[PDB]
Amino acid sequence: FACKTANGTAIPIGGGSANVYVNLAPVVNVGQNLVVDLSTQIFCHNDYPETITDYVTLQRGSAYGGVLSNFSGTVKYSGSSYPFPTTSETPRVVYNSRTDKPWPVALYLTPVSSAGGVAIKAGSLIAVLILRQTNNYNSDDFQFVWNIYANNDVVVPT
Amino acid sequence: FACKTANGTAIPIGGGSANVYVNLAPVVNVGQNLVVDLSTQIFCHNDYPETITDYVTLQRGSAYGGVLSNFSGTVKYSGSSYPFPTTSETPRVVYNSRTDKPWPVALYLTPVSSAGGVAIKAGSLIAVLILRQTNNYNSDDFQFVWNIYANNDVVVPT
Ligand SMILES: CC(=O)N[C@@H]1[C@@H](O)[C@H](O[C@@H]2O[C@H](CO)[C@@H](O[C@@H]3O[C@H](CO[C@H]4O[C@H](CO)[C@@H](O)[C@H](O)[C@@H]4O)[C@@H](O)[C@H](O[C@H]4O[C@H](CO)[C@@H](O)[C@H](O)[C@@H]4O)[C@@H]3O)[C@H](O)[C@H]2NC(C)=O)[C@@H](CO[C@@H]2O[C@@H](C)[C@@H](O)[C@@H](O)[C@@H]2O)O[C@H]1O
Ligand SMILES: CC(=O)N[C@@H]1[C@@H](O)[C@H](O[C@@H]2O[C@H](CO)[C@@H](O[C@@H]3O[C@H](CO[C@H]4O[C@H](CO)[C@@H](O)[C@H](O)[C@@H]4O)[C@@H](O)[C@H](O[C@H]4O[C@H](CO)[C@@H](O)[C@H](O)[C@@H]4O)[C@@H]3O)[C@H](O)[C@H]2NC(C)=O)[C@@H](CO)O[C@H]1O
Ligand code: NI
Ligand code: NI
Numbered sequence: 001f002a003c004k005t006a007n008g009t010a011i012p013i014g015g016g017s018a019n020v021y022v023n024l025a026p027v028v029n030v031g032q033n034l035v036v037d038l039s040t041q042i043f044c045h046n047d048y049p050e051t052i053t054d055y056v057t058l059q060r061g062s063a064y065g066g067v068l069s070n071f072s073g074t075v076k077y078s079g080s081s082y083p084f085p086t087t088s089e090t091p092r093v094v095y096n097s098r099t100d101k102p103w104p105v106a107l108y109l110t111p112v113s114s115a116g117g118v119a120i121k122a123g124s125l126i127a128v129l130i131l132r133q134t135n136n137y138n139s140d141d142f143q144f145v146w147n148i149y150a151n152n153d154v155v156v157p158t
Numbered sequence: 159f160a161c162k163t164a165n166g167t168a169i170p171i172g173g174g175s176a177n178v179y180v181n182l183a184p185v186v187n188v189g190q191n192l193v194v195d196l197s198t199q200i201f202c203h204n205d206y207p208e209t210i211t212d213y214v215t216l217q218r219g220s221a222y223g224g225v226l227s228n229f230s231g232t233v234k235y236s237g238s239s240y241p242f243p244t245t246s247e248t249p250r251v252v253y254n255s256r257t258d259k260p261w262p263v264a265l266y267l268t269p270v271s272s273a274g275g276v277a278i279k280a281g282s283l284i285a286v287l288i289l290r291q292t293n294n295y296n297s298d299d300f301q302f303v304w305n306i307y308a309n310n311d312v313v314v315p316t
Contacts, residue, residue, distance in 0.1 A: 031246045033218075072217075074288060074303060081286045082175040083301040110218075 001054045001095065001133050003044035003103065003144055013047065015133070015142035024120060024154045034071070034109040034154065038129070039102035042146060046095045052137045054095040058105060059132035059143065061086040066120035067127060070156065071109040078104045089132065105129060111156045120154035159212045159253065159291050161202040161261070161302050171205065173291070173300035179309045182278060187315050192229065192267040196287065197260035200304060204253040210295040212253040216263055217290040217301070219244045224278035225285060228314070231267035239266070247290070263287060269314045278312035 004010045009018045020041055028034050046054045058077045061084050067073070073084035078093050084107055095101060107127065111119060120126060131144040162168045167176050178199055186192045204212045216235045220243050233242040236251050242265060253259060265285065269277060278284060289302040 072290075072299065072301070074301065079283060080175065080177070080305050081288075081303045083173050083303055087172060087174045 001044065001046055001135070001142075003042060003131070004100070005043075006041045011144045014140075015144050017145040017147065019147045019149060021149045021151045022126075023151050026152055027155050027157065028109075028111055028119075029157055030111050030113060030115070032110065034107075036107040036109065036127075036148070038105045038107075038146070038148075042103040042105070042131075043100040044095060044103055044131075044144075045098050045100050047098065049096050049098060052135050055092040055134045055136070056095055056103070057092050057132045058086065058090040059130040060089065060128075061107075061130070062128045064125045064127060066118075066124060066154070067109060070115035070119040071111055073107055073109045076104075076106045076108065084108075103131060115156040116158040117155065118153050119156045120150050122150060122153045124150050126150050159202065159204055159214075159293070159300070161200060161289070162258065164199045164201075166199075169302045173302045175303040175305065177305045177307060179307050180284075181309050182312050184310055185313050185315060186269060186277070188269050188271055188273065190268070192265075192269075192312060194265035194267065194285070194306070196263045196265075196304070196306070200261040200263070200289075201258035202253055202261055202289075203256050203258050205256065207254050207256060210293050213250040213292045213294070214253055214261070215250050215290045216244065216248045217288040218247070218286075219263075219265075219288070220286045221284070222286065223282040223284055224276075224308075224312070225265075225267060228270055228273040228277040229267040230270055231265055234262075234264045234266060236262045242267075261289060273314045274316040275313060276311050277314045278308045280308055280311045282308055284308050
């Protein structure tokens, strides 16, 4: 089991960490959501699907920086919605093919009423999402840690 | 502050996520209404009412599946109606007793004029409703995320 990003970086068998940059709507008002869909950027696969079934959760999602200070959020994982920052590890998604399959995570972020001006700075860390991978074969229990960075400033009109 | 569902589950203090399985009118003709009344399904309480006032909004409601594609409608929250899918967070409802009190959310849906046949597939996701809870006591700001599923097919006769 391993994963890769659309930009080209990889996290190998056994887990690790990577940095992912995301494009953000540059202007967001109270009542609107910024949608950060990581399923177009993070892809994983099972390396021995004939003999092993891989199980993949969103172990935790955390907010940083301007997302932590200026937004409230939800996360959608494989069709179900949860608070973001997260309160518990999600149910599992099965990975059962050598063909890359997206990691089905998307953030929905909405400004709090005190947000205004530059609420998320370009290049800043906005979130950490921890993918936990186990299987039905041995004791492997690995973390793939995705550090999510903004490409651009996000402004909340005042 | 925490919440529970009928014959069901709980989302504890600090928020979280749950699935709610709802029975739906099985036959809804064009021009008839499908009401999804969550006030019989979702109940909340204040855990320290002698000292704290809890405030609860419908921060967002979103449609999925056959409700998104085959119905149009509104959401009523505590006596007032609003567009559904929602465009703004609602006014607050006060919770001030340890006795379970309903969350006063209902969807009022009507088939689109081209709908016919199976318009809501049994077991499918129909809505996500985000309950936001704050108080007059500390900085708590917690999301209770309700993933709403149809227990049965809804047919629009032709
Ligand atoms: C006359 C007067 O008011 N005197 C003050 C005391 O009331 C006060 O004691 C507070 O009282 C509040 C109730 O109003 C209690 O708050 C609840 O705490 C629950 C958790 O308590 C446990 O965990 C704490 C750490 O998590 C720990 O410190 C405690 O000892 C307990 O083990 C919490 O679940 C609850 O919140 C839920 O419920 C409400 C109501 O529905 C929701 O609004 C919330 O969102 C959440 O769902 C609520 O917070 C305090 O436990 C109690 N503290 C103590 C030590 O007894 C004291 C202390 O004030 C606290 O300390 C000050 C410094 C400040 O930080 C306050 O915010 C704290 O409550 O002060 C007296 O003067
Ligand atoms: C009929 C039959 O197959 N009988 C079995 C043999 O299959 C079995 O041989 C093993 O088959 C398993 C697959 O089920 C292999 O498991 C993977 O091993 C690789 C690493 O393998 C390389 O490294 C091994 C030593 O480290 C070498 O022996 C081997 O030759 C290779 O060079 C792991 O990377 C895999 O795990 C990764 O992928 C899975 C799936 O995505 C994830 O779940 C993991 O978390 C991890 O990301 C598997 O562990 C194993 O290599 C095969 N062994 C050999 C020698 O070929 C044989 C051995 O016990 O037993 C017979 O009964
Ligand atoms: Ni591989
Ligand atoms: Ni209670």
